[PDB]
Short mmCIF file of C-alpha atoms in Angstrom, two decimals:
data_model
loop_
_atom_site.label_atom_id
_atom_site.label_comp_id
_atom_site.label_asym_id
_atom_site.label_seq_id
_atom_site.Cartn_x
_atom_site.Cartn_y
_atom_site.Cartn_z
CA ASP A 12 172.04 26.85 43.34
CA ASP A 13 172.78 27.88 39.78
CA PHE A 14 176.49 27.13 40.29
CA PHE A 15 176.03 23.51 39.29
CA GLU A 16 173.84 24.57 36.35
CA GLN A 17 176.37 26.95 34.68
CA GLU A 18 179.08 24.49 35.66
CA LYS A 19 177.33 21.79 33.62
CA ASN A 20 177.27 23.91 30.46
CA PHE A 21 180.89 25.05 30.90
CA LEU A 22 182.33 21.54 31.33
CA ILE A 23 180.39 20.17 28.31
CA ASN A 24 181.58 23.00 26.07
CA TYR A 25 185.12 23.19 27.43
CA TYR A 26 185.65 19.42 26.87
CA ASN A 27 185.10 19.84 23.12
CA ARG A 28 187.39 22.86 23.10
CA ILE A 29 189.98 20.89 25.09
CA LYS A 30 189.73 17.79 22.89
CA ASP A 31 189.96 19.89 19.73
CA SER A 32 193.07 21.75 20.90
CA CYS A 33 194.56 18.42 21.96
CA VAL A 34 194.47 16.77 18.57
CA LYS A 35 195.62 20.02 16.94
CA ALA A 36 198.59 20.22 19.29
CA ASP A 37 199.49 16.54 18.52
CA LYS A 38 199.40 17.13 14.75
CA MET A 39 201.60 20.18 15.10
CA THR A 40 204.18 18.36 17.22
CA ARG A 41 204.18 15.36 14.91
CA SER A 42 204.78 17.71 11.96
CA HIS A 43 207.74 19.09 13.95
CA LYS A 44 209.42 15.69 14.17
CA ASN A 45 208.83 15.26 10.45
CA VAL A 46 210.87 18.40 9.73
CA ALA A 47 213.39 17.15 12.25
CA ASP A 48 213.76 13.88 10.25
CA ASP A 49 214.51 15.82 7.05
CA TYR A 50 217.26 17.66 8.91
CA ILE A 51 219.24 14.43 9.46
CA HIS A 52 218.27 13.18 6.02
CA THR A 53 219.59 16.47 4.53
CA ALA A 54 222.87 16.39 6.54
CA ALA A 55 223.42 12.87 5.17
CA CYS A 56 223.06 13.91 1.50
CA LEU A 57 225.27 16.94 2.27
CA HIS A 58 227.91 14.74 3.88
CA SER A 59 227.70 12.21 1.03
CA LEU A 60 227.82 15.01 -1.54
CA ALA A 61 230.89 16.69 -0.03
CA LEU A 62 233.01 13.56 -0.58
CA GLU A 63 233.96 13.82 -4.25
CA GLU A 64 234.58 17.55 -4.74
CA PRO A 65 237.45 20.09 -4.79
CA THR A 66 239.03 20.52 -1.37
CA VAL A 67 238.27 24.28 -1.24
CA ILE A 68 234.57 23.83 -0.93
CA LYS A 69 234.58 20.20 0.36
CA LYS A 70 235.36 21.50 3.84
CA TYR A 71 232.49 24.03 3.57
CA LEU A 72 229.93 21.25 2.94
CA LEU A 73 231.13 19.26 5.92
CA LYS A 74 230.44 22.30 8.13
CA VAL A 75 226.83 22.66 7.05
CA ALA A 76 226.14 18.95 7.18
CA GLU A 77 227.57 18.95 10.70
CA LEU A 78 225.29 21.93 11.44
CA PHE A 79 222.17 20.10 10.23
CA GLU A 80 223.06 17.02 12.30
CA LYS A 81 222.89 19.28 15.38
CA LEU A 82 219.82 21.25 14.29
CA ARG A 83 217.94 17.97 13.93
CA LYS A 84 218.76 17.34 17.58
CA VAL A 85 217.11 20.62 18.72
CA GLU A 86 214.05 20.14 16.49
CA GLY A 87 213.46 16.67 17.93
CA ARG A 88 213.87 18.19 21.40
CA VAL A 89 211.40 21.04 20.93
CA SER A 90 208.85 18.53 19.60
CA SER A 91 209.26 16.35 22.69
CA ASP A 92 208.98 19.27 25.13
CA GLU A 93 206.04 20.53 23.06
CA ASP A 94 204.23 17.23 23.53
CA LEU A 95 204.98 17.17 27.27
CA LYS A 96 204.01 20.75 28.14
CA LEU A 97 201.09 21.40 25.73
CA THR A 98 199.66 18.16 24.33
CA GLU A 99 200.07 16.35 27.65
CA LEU A 100 198.50 19.28 29.57
CA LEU A 101 195.49 19.31 27.24
CA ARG A 102 195.37 15.51 27.55
CA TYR A 103 195.39 15.60 31.38
CA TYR A 104 192.50 18.04 31.71
CA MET A 105 190.52 16.42 28.88
CA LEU A 106 190.14 13.48 31.26
CA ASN A 107 189.96 15.71 34.34
CA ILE A 108 186.93 17.37 32.80
CA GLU A 109 185.32 13.96 32.31
CA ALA A 110 185.86 13.33 36.04
CA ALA A 111 184.25 16.58 37.12
CA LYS A 112 181.40 15.71 34.76
CA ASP A 113 180.83 12.46 36.56
CA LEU A 114 180.72 14.35 39.90
CA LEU A 115 177.90 16.56 38.63
CA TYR A 116 176.09 13.51 37.28
CA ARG A 117 176.17 11.80 40.65
CA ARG A 118 175.10 14.90 42.52
CA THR A 119 171.99 15.34 40.41
CA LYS A 120 171.21 11.67 40.94
CA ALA A 121 171.29 12.08 44.71
CA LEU A 122 169.21 15.19 44.14
CA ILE A 123 166.33 13.32 42.59
CA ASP A 124 166.57 10.83 45.49
CA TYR A 125 166.00 13.70 47.92
CA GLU A 126 163.42 15.16 45.51
CA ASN A 127 161.39 11.98 45.85
CA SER A 128 161.47 11.92 49.64
CA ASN A 129 160.77 15.66 49.45
CA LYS A 130 157.37 14.87 47.93
CA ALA A 131 156.30 12.24 50.49
CA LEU A 132 157.13 13.42 54.00
CA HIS A 148 160.26 8.72 56.99
CA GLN A 149 163.62 8.57 55.23
CA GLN A 150 164.74 12.19 54.78
CA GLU A 151 168.31 10.84 54.50
CA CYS A 152 168.04 11.66 50.79
CA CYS A 153 168.16 15.29 51.89
CA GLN A 154 171.21 14.78 54.11
CA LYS A 155 172.84 12.64 51.44
CA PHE A 156 172.10 15.24 48.77
CA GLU A 157 173.79 17.94 50.86
CA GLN A 158 176.73 15.69 51.70
CA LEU A 159 177.31 15.41 47.93
CA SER A 160 176.32 18.96 46.85
CA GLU A 161 178.81 20.31 49.41
CA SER A 162 181.71 18.02 48.49
CA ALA A 163 180.91 18.43 44.81
CA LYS A 164 181.18 22.20 44.88
CA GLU A 165 184.21 21.84 47.13
CA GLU A 166 185.96 19.58 44.59
CA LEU A 167 184.86 21.52 41.47
CA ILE A 168 186.28 24.72 42.97
CA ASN A 169 189.38 22.74 43.94
CA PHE A 170 189.59 21.68 40.24
CA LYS A 171 189.44 25.21 38.94
CA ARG A 172 192.23 26.32 41.29
CA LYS A 173 194.43 23.39 40.23
CA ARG A 174 193.72 24.03 36.53
CA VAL A 175 194.83 27.65 36.69
CA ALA A 176 198.15 26.67 38.39
CA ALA A 177 198.82 23.88 35.89
CA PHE A 178 198.25 26.15 32.85
CA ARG A 179 200.45 28.91 34.32
CA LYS A 180 203.07 26.34 35.33
CA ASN A 181 203.31 24.71 31.90
CA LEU A 182 202.94 27.99 30.00
CA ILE A 183 205.93 29.39 31.88
CA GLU A 184 208.09 26.28 31.46
CA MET A 185 207.27 25.96 27.74
CA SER A 186 208.22 29.61 27.18
CA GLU A 187 211.57 28.96 28.94
CA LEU A 188 212.25 25.86 26.87
CA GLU A 189 211.28 27.60 23.64
CA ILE A 190 213.69 30.41 24.51
CA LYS A 191 216.37 27.85 25.39
CA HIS A 192 216.29 26.02 22.03
CA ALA A 193 215.79 29.29 20.10
CA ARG A 194 218.95 30.77 21.58
CA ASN A 195 220.72 27.44 20.98
CA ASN A 196 219.91 27.40 17.28
CA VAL A 197 220.84 31.09 16.99
CA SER A 198 224.34 30.45 18.42
CA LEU A 199 224.71 27.29 16.26
CA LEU A 200 223.76 29.14 13.06
CA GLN A 201 225.59 32.30 14.15
CA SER A 202 228.90 30.50 14.57
CA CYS A 203 228.52 28.81 11.17
CA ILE A 204 227.70 32.07 9.32
CA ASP A 205 230.47 34.01 11.08
CA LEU A 206 232.79 31.11 10.20
CA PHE A 207 232.07 31.33 6.47
CA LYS A 208 232.03 35.12 6.43
CA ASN A 209 235.54 34.88 7.92
CA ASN A 210 236.89 31.96 5.93
CA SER B 5 243.09 7.71 -26.80
CA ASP B 6 242.26 10.08 -23.97
CA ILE B 7 240.72 8.60 -20.81
CA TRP B 8 240.12 12.09 -19.23
CA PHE B 9 236.83 12.55 -21.03
CA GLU B 10 235.48 9.11 -20.30
CA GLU B 11 236.56 9.57 -16.67
CA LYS B 12 235.39 13.13 -16.19
CA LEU B 13 232.01 12.22 -17.65
CA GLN B 14 231.59 9.72 -14.83
CA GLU B 15 232.43 12.27 -12.10
CA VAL B 16 229.90 14.67 -13.64
CA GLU B 17 227.11 12.06 -13.97
CA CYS B 18 227.79 10.96 -10.40
CA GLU B 19 227.68 14.49 -8.93
CA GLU B 20 224.36 15.13 -10.63
CA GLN B 21 223.01 12.03 -8.86
CA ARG B 22 224.09 13.36 -5.44
CA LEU B 23 222.51 16.70 -6.34
CA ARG B 24 219.12 15.18 -7.24
CA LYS B 25 219.26 13.19 -4.00
CA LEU B 26 219.85 16.21 -1.78
CA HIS B 27 217.39 18.21 -3.88
CA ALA B 28 214.54 15.67 -3.54
CA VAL B 29 215.22 15.56 0.24
CA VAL B 30 214.94 19.38 0.37
CA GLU B 31 211.67 19.30 -1.54
CA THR B 32 210.19 17.00 1.13
CA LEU B 33 211.60 19.39 3.74
CA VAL B 34 209.89 22.39 2.10
CA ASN B 35 206.56 20.50 2.04
CA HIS B 36 206.96 19.21 5.56
CA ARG B 37 207.63 22.77 6.74
CA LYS B 38 204.62 23.97 4.77
CA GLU B 39 202.61 21.14 6.32
CA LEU B 40 203.85 22.20 9.77
CA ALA B 41 202.90 25.90 9.25
CA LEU B 42 199.38 24.70 8.37
CA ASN B 43 199.02 22.54 11.48
CA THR B 44 200.39 25.49 13.51
CA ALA B 45 197.70 27.74 12.00
CA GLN B 46 194.99 25.23 12.96
CA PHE B 47 196.39 24.98 16.52
CA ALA B 48 196.52 28.78 16.89
CA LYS B 49 192.85 28.98 16.00
CA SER B 50 191.85 26.22 18.45
CA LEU B 51 193.76 28.08 21.18
CA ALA B 52 191.85 31.28 20.69
CA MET B 53 188.57 29.36 20.72
CA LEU B 54 189.66 27.65 23.94
CA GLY B 55 190.46 31.00 25.50
CA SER B 56 186.99 32.21 24.58
CA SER B 57 185.37 29.02 25.94
CA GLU B 58 187.32 29.58 29.16
CA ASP B 59 185.45 31.06 32.18
CA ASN B 60 188.64 32.20 33.91
CA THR B 61 189.47 35.70 32.63
CA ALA B 62 193.23 35.25 33.33
CA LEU B 63 193.34 31.98 31.43
CA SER B 64 191.30 33.42 28.54
CA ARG B 65 193.79 36.33 28.42
CA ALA B 66 196.85 34.08 28.49
CA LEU B 67 195.31 31.56 26.06
CA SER B 68 194.30 34.36 23.67
CA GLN B 69 197.86 35.77 23.91
CA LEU B 70 199.37 32.38 23.30
CA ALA B 71 197.33 31.97 20.11
CA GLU B 72 198.73 35.29 18.85
CA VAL B 73 202.23 33.90 19.41
CA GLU B 74 201.39 30.75 17.49
CA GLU B 75 199.88 32.95 14.82
CA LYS B 76 203.20 34.73 14.36
CA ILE B 77 205.13 31.43 14.38
CA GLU B 78 203.08 29.83 11.64
CA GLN B 79 203.98 32.76 9.40
CA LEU B 80 207.66 32.29 10.16
CA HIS B 81 207.24 28.60 9.26
CA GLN B 82 205.72 29.45 5.88
CA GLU B 83 208.26 32.10 5.04
CA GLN B 84 211.00 29.74 6.22
CA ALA B 85 209.59 27.03 3.92
CA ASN B 86 209.43 29.58 1.10
CA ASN B 87 213.00 30.53 1.88
CA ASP B 88 214.01 26.89 1.97
CA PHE B 89 212.48 26.15 -1.40
CA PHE B 90 213.59 29.31 -3.26
CA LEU B 91 216.99 29.91 -1.66
CA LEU B 92 218.10 26.34 -0.96
CA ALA B 93 215.97 24.29 -3.38
CA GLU B 94 216.35 26.57 -6.41
CA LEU B 95 220.08 26.72 -5.65
CA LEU B 96 220.27 22.97 -6.31
CA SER B 97 218.12 22.94 -9.46
CA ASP B 98 220.33 25.55 -11.07
CA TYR B 99 223.49 23.48 -10.61
CA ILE B 100 221.63 20.42 -11.88
CA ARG B 101 220.75 22.62 -14.86
CA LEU B 102 224.41 23.51 -15.38
CA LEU B 103 225.57 19.92 -14.98
CA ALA B 104 223.20 18.88 -17.76
CA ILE B 105 224.83 21.62 -19.84
CA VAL B 106 228.19 19.91 -19.51
CA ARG B 107 226.57 16.55 -20.24
CA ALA B 108 225.18 17.95 -23.48
CA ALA B 109 228.70 19.13 -24.25
CA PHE B 110 230.04 15.58 -23.86
CA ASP B 111 227.10 14.42 -25.95
CA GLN B 112 227.83 17.05 -28.60
CA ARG B 113 231.45 15.96 -28.63
CA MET B 114 230.38 12.44 -29.43
CA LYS B 115 228.11 13.73 -32.19
CA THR B 116 230.88 15.72 -33.89
CA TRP B 117 233.14 12.68 -33.39
CA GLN B 118 230.48 10.42 -34.91
CA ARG B 119 230.01 12.70 -37.92
CA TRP B 120 233.81 12.86 -38.25
CA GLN B 121 233.89 9.05 -38.22
CA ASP B 122 231.01 8.96 -40.69
CA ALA B 123 232.97 11.23 -42.97
CA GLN B 124 235.96 8.84 -42.81
CA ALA B 125 233.70 6.02 -43.97
CA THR B 126 232.48 8.20 -46.85
CA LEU B 127 236.06 8.82 -48.00
CA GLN B 128 236.98 5.14 -48.30
CA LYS B 129 234.09 4.58 -50.74
CA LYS B 130 235.57 7.33 -52.85
CA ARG B 131 239.02 5.87 -52.95
CA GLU B 132 237.55 2.47 -53.75
CA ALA B 133 235.48 4.03 -56.53
CA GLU B 134 238.68 5.25 -58.13
CA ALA B 135 240.50 1.90 -57.73
CA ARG B 136 237.77 0.23 -59.77
CA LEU B 137 238.00 2.89 -62.46
CA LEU B 138 241.79 2.62 -62.71
CA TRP B 139 241.30 -0.60 -64.77
CA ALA B 140 238.42 0.84 -66.87
CA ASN B 141 238.84 2.75 -70.06
CA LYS B 142 237.25 6.09 -69.18
CA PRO B 143 239.63 8.86 -68.09
CA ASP B 144 236.79 11.32 -67.64
CA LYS B 145 234.99 9.31 -64.95
CA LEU B 146 238.40 8.63 -63.36
CA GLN B 147 239.07 12.34 -62.82
CA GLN B 148 235.55 12.57 -61.43
CA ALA B 149 236.53 10.03 -58.75
CA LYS B 150 239.91 11.69 -58.08
CA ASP B 151 238.12 14.96 -57.51
CA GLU B 152 235.55 13.64 -55.03
CA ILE B 153 238.47 12.13 -53.08
CA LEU B 154 240.18 15.48 -52.97
CA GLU B 155 236.95 17.16 -51.78
CA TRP B 156 236.26 14.58 -49.07
CA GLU B 157 239.97 14.59 -48.08
CA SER B 158 239.34 18.17 -46.93
CA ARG B 159 235.92 17.34 -45.43
CA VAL B 160 237.25 14.77 -43.02
CA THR B 161 239.97 17.33 -42.32
CA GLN B 162 237.24 19.82 -41.31
CA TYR B 163 235.32 17.33 -39.12
CA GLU B 164 238.61 16.31 -37.53
CA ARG B 165 239.40 19.94 -36.73
CA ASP B 166 235.91 20.43 -35.38
CA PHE B 167 236.32 17.49 -33.00
CA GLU B 168 239.54 19.03 -31.72
CA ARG B 169 237.81 22.36 -31.00
CA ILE B 170 234.71 20.78 -29.54
CA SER B 171 236.90 18.69 -27.25
CA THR B 172 238.48 21.94 -26.15
CA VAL B 173 235.14 23.60 -25.42
CA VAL B 174 234.10 20.82 -23.07
CA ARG B 175 237.37 21.23 -21.28
CA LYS B 176 236.79 25.02 -21.16
CA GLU B 177 233.21 24.48 -19.94
CA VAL B 178 234.16 22.08 -17.14
CA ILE B 179 236.76 24.52 -15.79
CA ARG B 180 234.20 27.32 -16.01
CA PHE B 181 231.68 25.31 -14.03
CA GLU B 182 234.24 24.50 -11.31
CA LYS B 183 235.63 28.02 -10.94
CA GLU B 184 232.10 29.51 -10.85
CA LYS B 185 231.17 27.05 -8.10
CA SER B 186 233.80 27.96 -5.55
CA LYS B 187 233.32 31.67 -6.30
CA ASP B 188 229.58 31.87 -5.50
CA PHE B 189 228.83 28.75 -3.46
CA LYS B 190 230.00 30.13 -0.11
CA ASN B 191 227.84 33.25 -0.43
CA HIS B 192 224.74 31.38 -1.57
CA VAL B 193 225.06 29.13 1.50
CA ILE B 194 225.46 32.10 3.88
CA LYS B 195 222.41 33.71 2.32
CA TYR B 196 220.21 30.74 3.30
CA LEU B 197 221.87 30.15 6.65
CA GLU B 198 220.96 33.76 7.50
CA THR B 199 217.34 32.98 6.65
CA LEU B 200 217.33 30.32 9.38
CA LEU B 201 219.14 32.59 11.86
CA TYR B 202 216.51 35.30 11.36
CA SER B 203 213.71 32.79 12.08
CA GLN B 204 215.38 31.61 15.29
CA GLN B 205 215.90 35.17 16.39
CA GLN B 206 212.18 35.81 15.79
CA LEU B 207 211.18 32.69 17.70
CA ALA B 208 213.13 33.79 20.79
CA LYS B 209 211.66 37.29 20.82
CA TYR B 210 208.21 35.82 20.40
CA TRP B 211 208.56 33.66 23.48
CA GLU B 212 210.55 36.20 25.53
CA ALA B 213 207.55 38.50 25.15
CA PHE B 214 205.01 35.84 26.10
CA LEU B 215 206.95 34.63 29.17
CA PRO B 216 206.00 37.72 31.24
CA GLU B 217 202.36 37.23 30.16
CA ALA B 218 202.47 33.62 31.41
CA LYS B 219 203.94 34.56 34.82
CA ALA B 220 201.22 37.30 35.07
CA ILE B 221 198.57 34.57 35.34
CA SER B 222 196.94 34.95 38.75
#
């Protein structure tokens, strides 16, 4: 059965690809919250700068500082949802791969046990035990693949919806502000 | 004495402080957004590699497509950062450059005033030089002193008139800086705000196009 052979190579390689994309997703999200921090830090300087100033513009500054205070809320939200849908998904299956790896390790162990009794013959149980594991192993590994495809599609869909939600939110927020100034 | 100059100089020096504050904060925002675009570029690459490492064709397709989305987003991040820096961050540096121009005006006013005061000190020595010669027995040197007093009498008159004009230029400059602000500030702000609106509009379209690809995962 070459299924457990190719499966061994796939899991080993995919784990490194999963771990790599996990740390990269984390760094990206963390950089998002950084930009989110500057948003509130900028709205503060804007609000503090609009104090002493002619009244004509003074009101204009308070509208942009109020805008940045809200934009910082959406940026911190997209970073959170980004960590939950992407980074967490890669996290989950980085450990899930390690579990499937352990399954293959145990199966091969029981295989050598049957391989030993296969070279002697009165304890052929190593053969029955090897098949009790080889069957459940392939049954679980295939169960893993099916669960991984649904998880990726589930998160990829939800993330897309959330990204569109915040994107439209910021568009309306900015839009109202621009249309407000254009029509003083 | 006129308190307006001593007071207005404080308002100007204080506003410049608030400008440098907001400017420095924006500089960190530009870098942080540049730092984000870089991390996004790295993530986009890792995604494509993951899609290739995948054994499920559908997942490889979706993953590869997701990387393309991230590839477009990282560009928006960089252009946004570039738009931040140039539009918003060079907007601040210019005003800080104009504020320093009015500060130099106040400094130049003190210079002219100082030279005007220095001329006043030079005149007293002339009058004193004549007082000492009034008792001497040399009418020639006396007229020499009376002449230098006449000359410096007009000199201090010139420095005094210069201080009056220089004090008027600073007043004309401050009004020019204020009127120019309210006339162009609103537009410059809208220009940058539109740069953020365009980015958001691009983000939505990016994900709205990927959403059908995610649902198509079988």
